[PDB]
Ligand binder design. Structure first.
Ligand SMILES: CC(=O)Nc1nccc(-c2c(C)nc3ccccn23)n1
Length: 264
């Protein structure tokens, strides 16, 4: 760590830093684990933040990117992110997740704060392999052996927030999170989700709300985009669309790679 000069606090704790002798600016994270971290160094992809070095002496040295998606959404709040720029970001994240998922690795806590962007129009996943708003309902209902579907759920909540400029399900506790999901998509039962009533934290006493129309939940989104969102938010994890199959959805027929307007 004598080889690094802390520039500033970025957001254990994460620091922007300069390799005192090398030229690189980098993002430095101060934290069976050692072996797990060694499997991540080899998990390299254009939509995954690069893990440069693992220093057990345990610090993690990542590639640096200049902005997170949460701050970018706040700066675009007045006018909103142009739809072609929303569509490009979703397409790329789906590529990232498809990659992770084919090597059996989950993210588990996806959110706007850990999604990083550059001037080139690229978007990357961070915290891979290491707020309740983006949490999948199987996690809330006590399933202990949850699947890659938990990430697809989280990415759909994020898709929706970009389009509407509001958080889809902004809960401040586990039961609040759950009841907001229920009020929008209807309380789940054995019809839509087989096995649901025999989950560790399921209660037969849950209120029974009815489902709302998707044209109400994300109005300005066109029909292809609303179709894909409803398959990313299916209650049953085995019905939820996989990353690979979402990439072939007709929503991405006309996809491009626009450049964003970033003020750094
Ligand atoms: C502006 C910015 O956050 N850049 C950046 N580059 C690379 C990595 C990270 C990073 C990593 C590795 N973990 C977290 C957690 C929260 C926010 C950013 N990060 N952050």
């Amino acid at each position: 760590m004598e080889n690094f000069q802390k520039v500033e606090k970025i957001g254990g704790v994460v620091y922007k830093a300069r390799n005192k002798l090398t030229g690189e600016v980098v993002a430095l994270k101060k934290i069976t684990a050692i072996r797990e971290i060694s499997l991540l160094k080899e998990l390299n992809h254009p939509n995954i933040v690069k893990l440069l070095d693992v220093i057990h002496t345990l610090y993690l040295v990542f590639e640096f990117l200049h902005q997170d998606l949460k701050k970018f959404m706040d700066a675009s709040a007045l006018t909103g992110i142009p739809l072609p720029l929303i569509k490009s970001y979703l397409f790329q994240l789906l590529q990232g997740l498809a990659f992770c998922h084919s090597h059996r690795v989950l993210h588990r806590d996806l959110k706007p704060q850990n999604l990083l962007i550059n001037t080139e129009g690229a978007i990357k996943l961070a915290d891979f392999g290491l707020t309740l708003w983006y949490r999948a309902p199987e996690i809330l209902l006590g399933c202990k052996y949850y699947s890659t579907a938990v990430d697809i759920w989280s990415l759909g909540c994020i898709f929706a927030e970009m389009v509407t400029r509001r958080a889809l399900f902004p809960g401040d506790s586990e039961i609040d999170q759950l009841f907001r999901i229920f009020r929008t998509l209807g309380t789940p039962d054995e019809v839509v989700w087989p096995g649901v009533t025999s989950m560790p934290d399921y209660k037969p006493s849950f209120p029974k709300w009815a489902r709302q129309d998707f044209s109400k939940v994300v109005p300005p989104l066109d029909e292809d985009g609303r179709s894909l969102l409803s398959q990313m938010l299916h209650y049953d994890p085995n019905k939820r669309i996989s990353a690979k199959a979402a990439l072939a959805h007709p929503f991405f027929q006309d996809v491009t790679k626009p450049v964003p307007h970033l003020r750094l």
